[PDB]
RNA sequence: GUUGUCGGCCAUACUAAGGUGAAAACACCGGAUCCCAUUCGAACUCCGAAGUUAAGCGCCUUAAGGCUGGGUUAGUACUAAGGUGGGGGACCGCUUGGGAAGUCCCAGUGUCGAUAGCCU
RNA sequence: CUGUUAAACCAUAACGCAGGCGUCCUAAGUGUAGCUCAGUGAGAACGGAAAUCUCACGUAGAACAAAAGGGUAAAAGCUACAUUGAUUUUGAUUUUCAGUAGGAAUACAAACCGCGAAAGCGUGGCCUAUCGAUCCUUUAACUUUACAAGUUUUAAGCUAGAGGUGUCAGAAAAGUUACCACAGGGAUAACUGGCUUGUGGCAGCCAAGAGUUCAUAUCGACGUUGCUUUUUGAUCCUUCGAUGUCGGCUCUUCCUAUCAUUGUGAAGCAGAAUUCACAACGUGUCGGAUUGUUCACCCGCUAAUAGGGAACGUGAGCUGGGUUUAG
RNA sequence: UCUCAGGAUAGCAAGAGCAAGUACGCAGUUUUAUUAGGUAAAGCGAAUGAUUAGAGGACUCGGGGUUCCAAGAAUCUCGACCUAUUCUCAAACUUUAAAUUGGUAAGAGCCGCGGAGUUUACUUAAAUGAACUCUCGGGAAGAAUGCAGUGCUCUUAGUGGGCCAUUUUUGGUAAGCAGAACUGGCGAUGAGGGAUGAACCUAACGUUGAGAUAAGGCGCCCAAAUGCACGCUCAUCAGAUACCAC
């Protein structure tokens, strides 16, 4: 799929349509200190082998993309989900119109 | 060996034609429906003898070719090829199947083709001159014996393979109302555009 | 008549004589009284329930019945469904329509004979 | 049935009627609808939006709301031996007015008229309609056509 | 194992057993499926209509306006 | 009687080869400076007024094709309820109800409008 | 998920038919404008069956990502241009339905926009498939909390996306047992019996032909009507708190689709031998090689060395070679 | 639902209650009014798909053989294109199109572009519309038939392997096989009849007498006709009847 890096859309803070930089979403790491990590560790200490289950059977070949939009005007951030895709290419509107002209 | 005809006799199915839903349905052993002098004019062979299936059943194509070949040899030898037009009215459209571990799914491959016949459907038709009517009636009867159960033999008062009664046919002869194509006759109505009728030539 | 199409094989209907009607109401007469099943004996009853309609008497009943006058409906509902007897004549064949020598259908005029057998 | 989807088994129900291909049908565009009217609901295949579920095609509902492009209608569905009210919203396309009330009003007005006049004259008029009634006695003077049962003949 | 997959046999009769229940015709019906435009109108036209009896303090509000 | 404009129904309106054409309209028609337009002023756009019913278009013509409606088809095929009905069966038929479709026949061939007009 | 089975509302089974889904698309979404496609006839250098250019005719026979069905002609198709409505709030409705969830889609009310003169149309793909909870993590947005008081840093929250469970209402999970075990199951296999009879076996009908001549002495192709339950298969009714599951030996009785013997009819019957048929089991139908064998094959005698049934007759009658515990 | 011998969950069932049991109400019924539908059939000289027969054809699209003489013309053979036809068909074809059947209705909560009101981003150029209120005018009750089953609460048992018949049906050669549809039934159910026997025929059960029956019978076993009249039948293999034993 081809997603334009620049896009005009709604901004809540600006209450109008803004130019937003469009980037893909990135899952960031698990902070060592979240209650979850804490418990996992604490259970797992001592004996009782492994505690929580481990997920062996994974069926999906595709991951739903999260578009991150940043408003140029107000700096605000918003996430939208997109349909399943195997490939994602982001492109400058410049190169997009250039490629459309060539074709 | 081929399964006994008594298996497929009764039409228990809904009709299974050779279709784009049917792969590898074989052919039917009866390929030719006309024998004798096919070139004859309605005038040349006036009388018709029909085999009419009295029963409701499925006749195997193989059975058809059988009864046919038979009737043909009979007629050709005993009168002359010149003297009879033999036509097989019925065609074998229906495909039989045969299921060849256990019952897991029974849907069968294609066994052979059969013609689905209902009570009163004409199986065979022969057209001939008077002197030969009997002979025809004879050979047809014999072909009836190549056949499942009951079928009967009949003489039509219509003209050859035409829809006209010999009387209508004769009147329309007299009045020059008849046009001739082979086994077919055309009748002329008042509904036609005058650019056709012979007179404006 | 349309509502009888469905029951034809389970029942015989016909066109009764006034005589028949009377006979029925004298021998088999019973009345629907505040839900009770009450033998037709006095006329006080016909007055009780139907009096105001102008039915004072068994004979009157029989009249609105045979004429089918202004109030048929109440004249009828007044009359308890008739519990009959075994026919003295056997029925002919109950599988067959009166037309085939059977019993189910309208025996147009003939219902009377049947009633006579049952009374 | 292995598949259940909004349009399953919709083939001949929704196909446009013969020679209806691409009919716009401006009349439906102009029909006026009011909160209390009775609507009959009929799908057209060219217009995909506001399509009712096939079950409701040819049903008669009672109007309930009026939206800009669509009439809210009310129908009922028997489910497990009970009736369940269903609030449908149909785009204008798949809706037409039912004559079931029109007949009623026309009839009523005429009837009422008759009764009022009769009330003027002391004659009580009744509007009750009686079904087919047993035929009155008749005299018949006509030409007799005497038929006899035909012999059997075979036409081949 | 072997079973009978789907039969609808006894279910129809079962359904007719106690009758088919039909809901009650209520003069006043719920507001589902009715647009807000119309609804606000109703609210307003009711609040202002004197021929429609309101509560006491309500009429105070209406009569002040 | 007839016309343009916007129409509801969408062949009884369509298709083919013809006849005919008051008036007014509609058109074909003349011309590319201007708004507009294309490879091309063909078209689209603009400006007109030397011609013309030859086109389009109205109205009619065809033992015309099509379409529309009735007739036959036929109480046929199919079908509702009953059957300790018949038949080895396939199937057929008895009693009480509904009831079709093609060949072939005969008729019809656009209708309803609002608006401004022509026929003094 | 589509079309059929499915029997004109809906609904309806089978390891029933024919197929399709875990993707693809910044345009293949959205809008405006113009254009009319598939194909056919006639015509123009190189030019040839097929390149481009023309005209006339073209109800749609073409095209519309993907399977099918439906839908579409001044368009939903083709061309060109513009734009992100594949957006912000909620809630409702329809399909399946426990009328829970989830998936889809629809109609509203508030917005903020895009295209067009404008009406209008846009909350994704013409419509019907293309999808995922609790806990946990991560992210976005918010004068939520850390409970003596504060400031930090850090940590908890509320609303909503994404990370996934395809056994798709969503457990973290490899084999072997003939050394075996328990609860049960005739809801279910292995033997008999039952229904069926395809397959096996045994009979007919028609008569092309074979019989040097001649269809039917004797046979019978192409077709076709049956019978039988000594084959095999199919089904799963009875028996799983057990009906002892191969064969032979022994013995008795029944069948006749008769091998021999009796009396006959028929012949392509000279005799001899043989073949076909009828009344017919009354009596008989043997000795050994090899094989656990049923069967098979051989060596022999014989009037003949018929085919079968009786829980595939016959284990409180044997035998135990085979089959199927533990070496 | 790791769910298939089980659980929940609706449905079916019992008891206790609530409410004015809107009777202008209700209905596994008709009637009447308005309406849906693409199945059966039929249809393929009508679309889609198959698919036999012969003929014609000014104009045709090519092949081959013929002939001549010569390369052309004349001409036999093929098909393709029309011409007028013709044989037999479709569950995944269809113009046409049933029976049986589905919606919604048949009035006091009715009808009538008559009135007066109410509406602060409801509608319109428009007192235009719309929705609700109070008014004005008219309205024998607006089909038959039946009501010894009015509606609703609450609490809860059992059940969740089914099986058979008529008709319709799919797989299968077929099966006392395996699956589905409507109504029953058998299970849960006795009585008389089919000698006999779950699902057939009559018929549904408190204790008991009478009478007249249904289904089926009346030569004997056996209650009741060796009744009274017809037609047909002689078997050295008679025949003797629904579901049924071929
Ligand atoms: Mg009797
Ligand atoms: Mg019965
Ligand atoms: Mg339709
Ligand atoms: Mg109920
Ligand atoms: Mg017609
Ligand atoms: Mg017919
Ligand atoms: Mg279901
Ligand atoms: Mg697949
Ligand atoms: Mg456009
Ligand atoms: Mg489902
Ligand atoms: Mg909008
Ligand atoms: Mg998730
Ligand atoms: Mg065999
Ligand atoms: Mg043979
Ligand atoms: Mg067994
Ligand atoms: Mg024992
Ligand atoms: Mg024993
Ligand atoms: Mg013998
Ligand atoms: Mg022999
Ligand atoms: Mg030995
Ligand atoms: Mg044994
Ligand atoms: Mg061992
Ligand atoms: Mg158990
Ligand atoms: Mg429960
Ligand atoms: Mg109670
Ligand atoms: Mg009443
Ligand atoms: Mg009904
Ligand atoms: Mg209709
Ligand atoms: Mg019947
Ligand atoms: Mg079964
Ligand atoms: Mg039935
Ligand atoms: Mg019944
Ligand atoms: Mg039980
Ligand atoms: Mg019983
Ligand atoms: Mg007694
Ligand atoms: Mg006697
Ligand atoms: Zn912003």
PDB file of N, CA, C and O (backbone and C1' of nucleotides) in Angstrom, chain H residues 136-156:
ATOM      1  P     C H 136     -67.228  22.144  19.112  1.00  0.00           P
ATOM      2  O5'   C H 136     -67.633  22.397  17.591  1.00  0.00           O
ATOM      3  C5'   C H 136     -67.499  23.680  17.006  1.00  0.00           C
ATOM      4  C4'   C H 136     -67.597  23.616  15.503  1.00  0.00           C
ATOM      5  C3'   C H 136     -68.371  22.442  14.934  1.00  0.00           C
ATOM      6  O3'   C H 136     -69.776  22.604  15.020  1.00  0.00           O
ATOM      7  C1'   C H 136     -66.361  22.709  13.727  1.00  0.00           C
ATOM      8  P     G H 137     -70.733  21.313  15.120  1.00  0.00           P
ATOM      9  O5'   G H 137     -70.547  20.626  13.685  1.00  0.00           O
ATOM     10  C5'   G H 137     -70.869  21.333  12.492  1.00  0.00           C
ATOM     11  C4'   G H 137     -70.760  20.460  11.264  1.00  0.00           C
ATOM     12  C3'   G H 137     -71.194  19.013  11.423  1.00  0.00           C
ATOM     13  O3'   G H 137     -72.598  18.842  11.395  1.00  0.00           O
ATOM     14  C1'   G H 137     -69.124  19.059  10.336  1.00  0.00           C
ATOM     15  P     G H 138     -73.276  17.606  12.171  1.00  0.00           P
ATOM     16  O5'   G H 138     -72.802  16.346  11.308  1.00  0.00           O
ATOM     17  C5'   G H 138     -73.191  16.212   9.945  1.00  0.00           C
ATOM     18  C4'   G H 138     -72.563  15.004   9.287  1.00  0.00           C
ATOM     19  C3'   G H 138     -72.689  13.682  10.034  1.00  0.00           C
ATOM     20  O3'   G H 138     -73.950  13.063   9.887  1.00  0.00           O
ATOM     21  C1'   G H 138     -70.468  13.956   9.365  1.00  0.00           C
ATOM     22  P     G H 139     -74.426  11.981  10.962  1.00  0.00           P
ATOM     23  O5'   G H 139     -73.266  10.892  10.902  1.00  0.00           O
ATOM     24  C5'   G H 139     -73.321   9.802   9.984  1.00  0.00           C
ATOM     25  C4'   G H 139     -72.260   8.763  10.294  1.00  0.00           C
ATOM     26  C3'   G H 139     -72.455   7.981  11.592  1.00  0.00           C
ATOM     27  O3'   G H 139     -73.289   6.835  11.441  1.00  0.00           O
ATOM     28  C1'   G H 139     -70.280   8.890  11.564  1.00  0.00           C
ATOM     29  P     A H 140     -74.381   6.474  12.570  1.00  0.00           P
ATOM     30  O5'   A H 140     -74.149   4.907  12.827  1.00  0.00           O
ATOM     31  C5'   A H 140     -74.536   3.921  11.863  1.00  0.00           C
ATOM     32  C4'   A H 140     -74.910   2.614  12.534  1.00  0.00           C
ATOM     33  C3'   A H 140     -75.997   1.778  11.838  1.00  0.00           C
ATOM     34  O3'   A H 140     -75.523   0.819  10.880  1.00  0.00           O
ATOM     35  C1'   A H 140     -76.655   2.212  14.061  1.00  0.00           C
ATOM     36  P     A H 141     -73.955   0.430  10.710  1.00  0.00           P
ATOM     37  O5'   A H 141     -73.424   0.245  12.216  1.00  0.00           O
ATOM     38  C5'   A H 141     -73.310  -1.057  12.807  1.00  0.00           C
ATOM     39  C4'   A H 141     -72.096  -1.208  13.724  1.00  0.00           C
ATOM     40  C3'   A H 141     -72.361  -2.029  14.999  1.00  0.00           C
ATOM     41  O3'   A H 141     -71.328  -3.028  15.236  1.00  0.00           O
ATOM     42  C1'   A H 141     -71.487   0.128  15.573  1.00  0.00           C
ATOM     43  P     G H 142     -69.819  -2.898  14.653  1.00  0.00           P
ATOM     44  O5'   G H 142     -69.987  -3.071  13.072  1.00  0.00           O
ATOM     45  C5'   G H 142     -68.861  -2.908  12.200  1.00  0.00           C
ATOM     46  C4'   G H 142     -69.274  -2.681  10.766  1.00  0.00           C
ATOM     47  C3'   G H 142     -68.133  -2.408   9.794  1.00  0.00           C
ATOM     48  O3'   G H 142     -68.459  -2.974   8.540  1.00  0.00           O
ATOM     49  C1'   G H 142     -69.618  -0.575   9.802  1.00  0.00           C
ATOM     50  P     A H 143     -68.094  -4.493   8.240  1.00  0.00           P
ATOM     51  O5'   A H 143     -69.502  -5.229   8.349  1.00  0.00           O
ATOM     52  C5'   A H 143     -69.651  -6.414   9.125  1.00  0.00           C
ATOM     53  C4'   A H 143     -69.809  -7.640   8.249  1.00  0.00           C
ATOM     54  C3'   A H 143     -69.893  -8.975   8.974  1.00  0.00           C
ATOM     55  O3'   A H 143     -71.185  -9.254   9.469  1.00  0.00           O
ATOM     56  C1'   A H 143     -68.332  -9.151   7.214  1.00  0.00           C
ATOM     57  P     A H 144     -71.364 -10.105  10.818  1.00  0.00           P
ATOM     58  O5'   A H 144     -71.198 -11.611  10.317  1.00  0.00           O
ATOM     59  C5'   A H 144     -71.926 -12.099   9.198  1.00  0.00           C
ATOM     60  C4'   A H 144     -71.453 -13.471   8.783  1.00  0.00           C
ATOM     61  C3'   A H 144     -71.276 -14.478   9.904  1.00  0.00           C
ATOM     62  O3'   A H 144     -72.489 -15.060  10.316  1.00  0.00           O
ATOM     63  C1'   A H 144     -69.373 -14.529   8.532  1.00  0.00           C
ATOM     64  P     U H 145     -72.878 -15.070  11.866  1.00  0.00           P
ATOM     65  O5'   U H 145     -71.992 -16.261  12.448  1.00  0.00           O
ATOM     66  C5'   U H 145     -71.732 -17.432  11.679  1.00  0.00           C
ATOM     67  C4'   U H 145     -70.609 -18.240  12.274  1.00  0.00           C
ATOM     68  C3'   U H 145     -70.455 -18.146  13.779  1.00  0.00           C
ATOM     69  O3'   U H 145     -71.374 -18.956  14.486  1.00  0.00           O
ATOM     70  C1'   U H 145     -68.353 -17.917  12.771  1.00  0.00           C
ATOM     71  P     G H 146     -71.683 -18.664  16.044  1.00  0.00           P
ATOM     72  O5'   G H 146     -70.331 -19.092  16.758  1.00  0.00           O
ATOM     73  C5'   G H 146     -69.991 -20.464  16.916  1.00  0.00           C
ATOM     74  C4'   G H 146     -68.597 -20.618  17.462  1.00  0.00           C
ATOM     75  C3'   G H 146     -68.401 -20.130  18.891  1.00  0.00           C
ATOM     76  O3'   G H 146     -68.665 -21.145  19.834  1.00  0.00           O
ATOM     77  C1'   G H 146     -66.719 -19.211  17.476  1.00  0.00           C
ATOM     78  P     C H 147     -69.226 -20.766  21.277  1.00  0.00           P
ATOM     79  O5'   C H 147     -67.997 -20.011  21.945  1.00  0.00           O
ATOM     80  C5'   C H 147     -67.400 -20.511  23.129  1.00  0.00           C
ATOM     81  C4'   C H 147     -66.172 -19.732  23.494  1.00  0.00           C
ATOM     82  C3'   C H 147     -66.375 -18.593  24.477  1.00  0.00           C
ATOM     83  O3'   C H 147     -66.410 -19.032  25.813  1.00  0.00           O
ATOM     84  C1'   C H 147     -65.032 -17.861  22.672  1.00  0.00           C
ATOM     85  P     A H 148     -67.803 -19.391  26.529  1.00  0.00           P
ATOM     86  O5'   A H 148     -67.358 -20.534  27.572  1.00  0.00           O
ATOM     87  C5'   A H 148     -65.972 -20.700  27.898  1.00  0.00           C
ATOM     88  C4'   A H 148     -65.714 -21.759  28.957  1.00  0.00           C
ATOM     89  C3'   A H 148     -64.449 -22.594  28.750  1.00  0.00           C
ATOM     90  O3'   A H 148     -63.322 -22.027  29.389  1.00  0.00           O
ATOM     91  C1'   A H 148     -66.314 -24.035  29.056  1.00  0.00           C
ATOM     92  P     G H 149     -62.674 -20.654  28.871  1.00  0.00           P
ATOM     93  O5'   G H 149     -61.786 -21.144  27.650  1.00  0.00           O
ATOM     94  C5'   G H 149     -61.172 -20.216  26.786  1.00  0.00           C
ATOM     95  C4'   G H 149     -59.687 -20.134  27.027  1.00  0.00           C
ATOM     96  C3'   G H 149     -58.943 -19.213  26.079  1.00  0.00           C
ATOM     97  O3'   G H 149     -58.842 -17.892  26.565  1.00  0.00           O
ATOM     98  C1'   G H 149     -57.913 -21.340  26.081  1.00  0.00           C
ATOM     99  P     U H 150     -58.887 -17.544  28.153  1.00  0.00           P
ATOM    100  O5'   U H 150     -58.588 -15.977  28.109  1.00  0.00           O
ATOM    101  C5'   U H 150     -58.895 -15.234  26.927  1.00  0.00           C
ATOM    102  C4'   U H 150     -58.193 -13.923  26.915  1.00  0.00           C
ATOM    103  C3'   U H 150     -56.728 -13.984  27.305  1.00  0.00           C
ATOM    104  O3'   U H 150     -55.887 -14.200  26.190  1.00  0.00           O
ATOM    105  C1'   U H 150     -57.833 -12.444  28.681  1.00  0.00           C
ATOM    106  P     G H 151     -54.373 -14.710  26.391  1.00  0.00           P
ATOM    107  O5'   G H 151     -53.627 -13.420  26.956  1.00  0.00           O
ATOM    108  C5'   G H 151     -53.398 -12.293  26.127  1.00  0.00           C
ATOM    109  C4'   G H 151     -53.007 -11.094  26.942  1.00  0.00           C
ATOM    110  C3'   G H 151     -51.709 -11.221  27.716  1.00  0.00           C
ATOM    111  O3'   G H 151     -50.576 -10.961  26.913  1.00  0.00           O
ATOM    112  C1'   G H 151     -53.389 -10.393  29.148  1.00  0.00           C
ATOM    113  P     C H 152     -49.250 -11.849  27.074  1.00  0.00           P
ATOM    114  O5'   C H 152     -48.679 -11.384  28.490  1.00  0.00           O
ATOM    115  C5'   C H 152     -48.001 -10.145  28.632  1.00  0.00           C
ATOM    116  C4'   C H 152     -48.094  -9.619  30.040  1.00  0.00           C
ATOM    117  C3'   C H 152     -47.106 -10.196  31.034  1.00  0.00           C
ATOM    118  O3'   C H 152     -45.818  -9.611  30.932  1.00  0.00           O
ATOM    119  C1'   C H 152     -49.266 -10.125  32.002  1.00  0.00           C
ATOM    120  P     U H 153     -44.498 -10.541  30.996  1.00  0.00           P
ATOM    121  O5'   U H 153     -44.072 -10.439  32.523  1.00  0.00           O
ATOM    122  C5'   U H 153     -44.934 -10.925  33.523  1.00  0.00           C
ATOM    123  C4'   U H 153     -44.592 -10.388  34.881  1.00  0.00           C
ATOM    124  C3'   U H 153     -43.586 -11.228  35.673  1.00  0.00           C
ATOM    125  O3'   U H 153     -42.275 -10.671  35.654  1.00  0.00           O
ATOM    126  C1'   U H 153     -45.677 -11.212  36.775  1.00  0.00           C
ATOM    127  P     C H 154     -40.970 -11.629  35.641  1.00  0.00           P
ATOM    128  O5'   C H 154     -41.101 -12.407  37.018  1.00  0.00           O
ATOM    129  C5'   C H 154     -41.045 -11.717  38.249  1.00  0.00           C
ATOM    130  C4'   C H 154     -41.311 -12.646  39.396  1.00  0.00           C
ATOM    131  C3'   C H 154     -40.545 -13.957  39.378  1.00  0.00           C
ATOM    132  O3'   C H 154     -39.209 -13.824  39.834  1.00  0.00           O
ATOM    133  C1'   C H 154     -42.806 -14.392  39.837  1.00  0.00           C
ATOM    134  P     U H 155     -38.033 -14.710  39.177  1.00  0.00           P
ATOM    135  O5'   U H 155     -38.235 -16.120  39.888  1.00  0.00           O
ATOM    136  C5'   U H 155     -38.153 -16.244  41.302  1.00  0.00           C
ATOM    137  C4'   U H 155     -38.532 -17.636  41.752  1.00  0.00           C
ATOM    138  C3'   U H 155     -37.965 -18.787  40.925  1.00  0.00           C
ATOM    139  O3'   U H 155     -36.625 -19.101  41.251  1.00  0.00           O
ATOM    140  C1'   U H 155     -40.260 -19.140  41.231  1.00  0.00           C
ATOM    141  P     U H 156     -35.603 -19.555  40.098  1.00  0.00           P
ATOM    142  O5'   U H 156     -36.101 -21.023  39.728  1.00  0.00           O
ATOM    143  C5'   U H 156     -35.844 -22.120  40.593  1.00  0.00           C
ATOM    144  C4'   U H 156     -36.860 -23.213  40.409  1.00  0.00           C
ATOM    145  C3'   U H 156     -36.700 -24.084  39.171  1.00  0.00           C
ATOM    146  O3'   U H 156     -35.680 -25.069  39.288  1.00  0.00           O
ATOM    147  C1'   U H 156     -38.947 -23.431  39.369  1.00  0.00           C
TER     148        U H 156
END
